[PDB]
Amino acid sequence: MLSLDYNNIFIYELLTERFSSENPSSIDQVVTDFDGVTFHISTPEEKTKILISLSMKCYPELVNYGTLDLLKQIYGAYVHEPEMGYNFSILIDLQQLPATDEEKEQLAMSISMLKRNVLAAPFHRAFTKQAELADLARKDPENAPMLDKQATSQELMAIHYRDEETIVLWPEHDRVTVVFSTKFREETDRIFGKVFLQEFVDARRRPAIQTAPQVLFSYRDPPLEIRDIQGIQKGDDFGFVTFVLFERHFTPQNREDCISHIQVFRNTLHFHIKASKAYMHQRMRKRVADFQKVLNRAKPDVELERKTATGRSFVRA
Amino acid sequence: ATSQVLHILPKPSYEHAFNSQRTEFVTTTATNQVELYEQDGNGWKHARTFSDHDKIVTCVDWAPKSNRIVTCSQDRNAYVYEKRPDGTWKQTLVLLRLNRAATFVRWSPNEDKFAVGSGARVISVCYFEQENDWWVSKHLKRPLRSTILSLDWHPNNVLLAAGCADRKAYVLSAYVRDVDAKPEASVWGSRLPFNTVCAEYPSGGWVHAVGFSPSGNALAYAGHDSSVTIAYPSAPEQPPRALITVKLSQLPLRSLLWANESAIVAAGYNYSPILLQGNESGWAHTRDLDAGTSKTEGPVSFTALRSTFRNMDLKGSSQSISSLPTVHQNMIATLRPYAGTPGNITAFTSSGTDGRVVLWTL
């Protein structure tokens, strides 16, 4: 696979099986996801009632960012009071699901896609702010730079979802710039990530893919706007990949795909580093075989009599 | 010179030995078996094998006078073989009482006794007691220090040149009462009791082989530093008159044979024998008897075509494999006389890890 999936496959399959089934069964399984997020599935009250919980270390910051309302108008009346040890909880009963199959399938997909659904609140807020500044600047072109600066100052938003990762996003009259504070431990991971990040920068440059958002990466130094932001170390070992999303990159027909893509970026990079390790393994063995071919000299020709198959010559003559 | 390849053994042979009439010869192989071969018109054919031993057979030697074969192997036991009147051979174990693997055996020129080299710090000398029909071994352990790599008798039947692996050449008196009479006074010495230190000489490596001159008044030994030293004794407890050392530019030598009273032929890991001409004044390499750097429209058979595809598939070249110039393909084992009166040798055989038994015609 080349592109990482955008939701939890186990939740999707479980929901599909339990919706299409006729005899439900009690289940209690806790499932982990990428980036430390953990999901818990249980049926404590009724065999036909399923409760799903979300765990995330940065969730209170999401609440500060205004994610409760987004979750509410995303998931309707399904909202349920959170369970112990978890952040967001949902309770679903199979007796009230829509009869039509496509509604059930889309509900299962939406529930399985809870990760980005809860993580996309800052992106939606940034898009709304970008629209506001766009219309305000269209009201008077001469009033752009000062409102742009005040938006870079006040609306500068940030989040820490991993302890070596950070998203810094802020809107403007025409763009929503985002900064990733990438850093890889596990030395060999950082070793391969250096090459991966270098090649990832070049990509955009090539005229072949100029339609993509502009990338900006420079290790050992952060951009001008985030040196004063708390949490950003003074370039200890952290890279900083910056994507500039213009108006065309979040057109009303392409917002969700862009959000999911920009969210999954880092996990894609990690998984593909591992895939590159496997690629080495296979090539390296594949032509150490050629070295063995080179060695197979220095063996005088000899003759084996039959050695027919799964046995020893199967005959005395 | 000129050489003819007698046979192509399927496996490496560290030793060989021909009978007195030069009719059939015995040879060793990698495993515990000992092989016999007899002439088949213009070639040689298999005769019989000996599986008496248990571990790798090290050395085999043929007595020409009595037509007997002795075999010392890694299993620390020695077997003596004598042909029965009907034609078969009778095995006979010899209790060497060794503690490690034997390495090299030789018959005395009178064939009454045979000495056995060993890695157990010692050398075993065995004779036959007709009154008991027994073989008894005596240990030579006074001056010896390391593994025995070679043996060499003396025409007086009493002195025994031992090539040890401690970078020192050894000469000992193997005289024993009830078997050999008193020997004449020799330049090596006169008073020769059993196990006496006749002489000791140094070297630049392991003494692969030793050898007395046909006149019996000299020793020639070769270390692992590709140097052959010719010793000329003067008197007991007296330094030799001249210790001539010739240093070569090839691989280390293995075995030494005396072509005549003033010529030595020796071969080693150089895949070729050499010749030394000289006298008491000095010696020098004379000639490379193996021709030196010789570097020696038609349907294709099925076997050749199949070989070409097999080489192409397993390989990336599909070209001639070795085309090595020298007659031998691996290290040579030893050189032994073939014919001629003592001091007059024109033919001598040789064996190697490639299994070739190449006769050399001077």
Side-chain angles (χ1 to χ4, degrees), chain A residues 7 12 15-16 19 75 98 100-113 117:
Chain A
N7 64 7
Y12 189 23
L15 286 172
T16 304
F19 291 168
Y75 291 128
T100 59
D101 291 331
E102 51 76 21
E103 286 291 328
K104 272 212 193 184
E105 176 265 323
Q106 77 181 12
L107 183 63
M109 173 57 112
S110 159
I111 297 169
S112 88
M113 184 95 58
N117 270 332

Side-chain angles (χ1 to χ4, degrees), chain A residues 144-155:
Chain A
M146 64 290 291
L147 283 84
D148 299 346
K149 274 282 151 273
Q150 78 167 351
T152 300
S153 73
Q154 312 151 356
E155 311 325 300

Side-chain angles (χ1 to χ4, degrees), chain A residues 25-278:
Chain A
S25 60
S26 46
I27 62 170
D28 185 74
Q29 307 143 332
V30 65
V31 193
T32 189
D33 291 331
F34 286 118
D35 291 331
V37 182
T38 307
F39 265 91
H40 177 37
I41 317 175
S42 55
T43 62
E45 185 200 291
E46 304 170 354
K47 176 172 317 309
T48 50
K49 267 183 193 165
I50 298 92
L51 188 152
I52 305 100
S53 276
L54 171 81
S55 174
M56 197 171 336
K57 63 151 271 193
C58 64
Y59 175 62
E61 293 179 353
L62 278 73
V63 175
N64 189 359
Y65 268 86
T67 316
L68 273 189
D69 49 345
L70 172 69
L71 278 173
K72 276 180 175 145
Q73 296 69 73
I74 278 177
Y75 291 128
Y78 295 162
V79 192
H80 193 296
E81 322 311 309
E83 205 183 1
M84 183 278 288
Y86 298 105
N87 296 115
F88 178 54
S89 165
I90 187 169
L91 188 153
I92 180 67
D93 199 359
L94 319 174
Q95 304 151 21
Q96 281 71 21
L97 268 71
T100 59
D101 291 331
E102 51 76 21
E103 286 291 328
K104 272 212 193 184
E105 176 265 323
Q106 77 181 12
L107 183 63
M109 173 57 112
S110 159
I111 297 169
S112 88
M113 184 95 58
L114 190 151
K115 183 144 170 283
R116 65 130 291 180
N117 270 332
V118 73
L119 184 62
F123 292 98
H124 278 319
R125 151 161 170 134
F127 290 169
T128 61
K129 293 187 286 185
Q130 184 276 328
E132 297 319 302
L133 282 72
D135 80 24
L136 268 185
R138 189 57 66 183
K139 184 33 52 193
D140 170 81
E142 283 217 352
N143 212 6
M146 64 290 291
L147 283 84
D148 299 346
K149 274 282 151 273
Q150 78 167 351
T152 300
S153 73
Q154 312 151 356
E155 311 325 300
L156 202 162
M157 295 298 102
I159 185 173
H160 296 285
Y161 76 101
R162 275 167 74 111
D163 50 52
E164 72 285 11
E165 281 325 316
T166 312
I167 306 90
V168 188
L169 59 88
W170 62 90
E172 213 179 354
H173 71 278
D174 47 25
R175 63 164 71 74
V176 180
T177 303
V178 54
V179 181
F180 273 97
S181 172
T182 179
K183 174 252 191 163
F184 295 110
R185 54 171 41 61
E186 201 258 341
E187 298 92 7
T188 175
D189 183 324
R190 177 187 28 88
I191 299 301
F192 282 5
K194 278 182 64 71
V195 167
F196 261 70
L197 287 162
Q198 289 180 359
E199 304 293 332
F200 174 79
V201 179
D202 329 317
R204 226 1 235 25
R205 285 93 276 301
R206 93 210 202 104
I209 58 172
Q210 301 296 30
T211 184
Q214 175 89 70
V215 300
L216 296 164
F217 152 81
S218 64
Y219 68 94
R220 219 178 161 178
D221 62 80
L224 281 170
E225 54 276 9
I226 69 168
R227 292 180 179 91
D228 70 16
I229 295 312
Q230 188 274 331
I232 302 301
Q233 290 162 347
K234 202 49 188 67
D236 291 331
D237 262 357
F238 284 61
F240 290 99
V241 188
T242 295
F243 308 121
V244 176
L245 307 155
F246 296 109
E247 177 77 28
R248 77 184 301 261
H249 284 112
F250 53 73
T251 187
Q253 277 80 244
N254 203 22
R255 272 171 283 97
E256 275 62 34
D257 303 278
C258 187
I259 282 175
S260 311
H261 203 241
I262 195 166
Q263 284 163 320
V264 65
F265 166 55
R266 193 222 186 276
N267 302 322
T268 73
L269 214 61
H270 192 207
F271 153 68
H272 263 287
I273 288 177
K274 324 302 283 292
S276 297
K277 274 190 220 174

Side-chain angles (χ1 to χ4, degrees), chain B residues 244-255:
Chain B
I244 297 89
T245 297
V246 54
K247 299 174 91 57
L248 277 297
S249 74
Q250 293 82 17
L251 277 296
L253 272 293
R254 184 101 181 170
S255 160

Side-chain angles (χ1 to χ4, degrees), chain B residues 158-159 172-175 177 181-198 236-237:
Chain B
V158 287
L159 294 174
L172 299 182
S173 179
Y175 157 75
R177 185 81 270 191
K182 288 308 188 186
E184 293 83 3
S186 88
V187 194
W188 306 96
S190 67
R191 174 53 33 201
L192 265 61
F194 176 73
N195 183 218
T196 183
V197 186
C198 194
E237 292 83 4

Side-chain angles (χ1 to χ4, degrees), chain B residues 1-320:
Chain B
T2 302
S3 66
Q4 184 178 2
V5 187
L6 261 56
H7 194 36
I8 310 293
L9 266 75
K11 284 172 101 173
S13 73
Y14 279 165
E15 266 312 289
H16 65 279
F18 293 62
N19 49 357
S20 200
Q21 301 324 300
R22 314 271 161 201
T23 316
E24 69 274 16
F25 88 103
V26 63
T27 183
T28 176
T29 175
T31 61
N32 65 307
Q33 272 141 0
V34 180
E35 294 294 328
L36 272 295
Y37 290 90
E38 293 179 353
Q39 293 145 80
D40 186 74
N42 298 333
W44 301 79
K45 68 181 178 67
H46 194 286
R48 64 161 41 72
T49 71
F50 291 165
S51 73
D52 311 297
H53 278 287
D54 219 336
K55 304 332 310 193
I56 297 89
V57 170
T58 61
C59 182
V60 63
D61 186 74
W62 204 325
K65 314 302 311 313
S66 69
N67 223 338
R68 273 173 300 157
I69 297 169
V70 67
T71 300
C72 298
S73 88
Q74 183 154 270
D75 73 38
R76 317 176 318 133
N77 305 314
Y79 275 79
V80 172
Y81 300 103
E82 190 158 353
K83 65 182 181 293
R84 262 175 206 133
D86 61 353
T88 189
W89 304 73
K90 176 172 71 72
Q91 42 74 30
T92 299
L93 182 65
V94 178
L95 297 186
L96 295 189
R97 317 171 322 184
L98 294 174
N99 296 115
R100 295 299 179 283
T103 44
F104 198 78
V105 73
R106 275 290 165 282
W107 280 98
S108 161
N110 293 164
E111 277 80 12
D112 52 4
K113 64 182 181 293
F114 67 99
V116 179
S118 161
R121 275 292 91 81
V122 286
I123 297 169
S124 289
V125 179
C126 299
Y127 51 90
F128 200 40
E129 293 179 353
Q130 287 69 240
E131 190 276 331
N132 290 318
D133 291 331
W134 269 16
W135 298 87
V136 298
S137 50
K138 309 289 289 301
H139 300 337
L140 297 171
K141 58 216 171 304
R142 177 78 256 157
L144 277 296
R145 184 191 281 310
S146 182
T147 291
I148 301 299
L149 279 194
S150 45
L151 281 76
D152 186 74
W153 280 118
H154 187 273
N156 293 0
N157 297 295
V158 287
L159 294 174
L160 172 67
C164 183
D166 63 358
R167 301 195 154 76
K168 303 192 261 303
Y170 287 112
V171 179
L172 299 182
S173 179
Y175 157 75
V176 64
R177 185 81 270 191
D178 187 74
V179 173
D180 279 324
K182 288 308 188 186
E184 293 83 3
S186 88
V187 194
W188 306 96
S190 67
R191 174 53 33 201
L192 265 61
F194 176 73
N195 183 218
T196 183
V197 186
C198 194
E200 286 187 28
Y201 306 118
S203 179
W206 316 299
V207 189
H208 270 165
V210 291
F212 289 162
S213 180
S215 67
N217 274 336
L219 182 62
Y221 64 74
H224 196 69
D225 63 358
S226 74
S227 85
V228 168
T229 298
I230 297 90
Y232 280 139
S234 306
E237 292 83 4
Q238 183 67 41
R241 258 170 298 115
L243 203 73
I244 297 89
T245 297
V246 54
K247 299 174 91 57
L248 277 297
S249 74
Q250 293 82 17
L251 277 296
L253 272 293
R254 184 101 181 170
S255 160
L256 275 75
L257 163 71
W258 274 88
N260 57 56
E261 69 275 16
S262 45
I264 297 169
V265 290
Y269 307 101
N270 48 6
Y271 323 115
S272 159
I274 69 181
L275 176 59
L276 281 63
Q277 300 289 52
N279 64 7
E280 50 164 39
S281 179
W283 296 80
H285 183 136
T286 292
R287 200 175 46 254
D288 289 328
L289 278 298
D290 208 348
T293 178
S294 64
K295 259 74 194 171
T296 50
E297 273 79 19
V300 57
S301 300
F302 161 78
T303 187
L305 204 50
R306 191 214 161 191
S307 85
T308 61
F309 292 101
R310 264 191 151 281
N311 296 0
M312 183 278 288
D313 189 359
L314 265 187
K315 299 289 94 176
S317 179
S318 75
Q319 184 66 41
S320 58

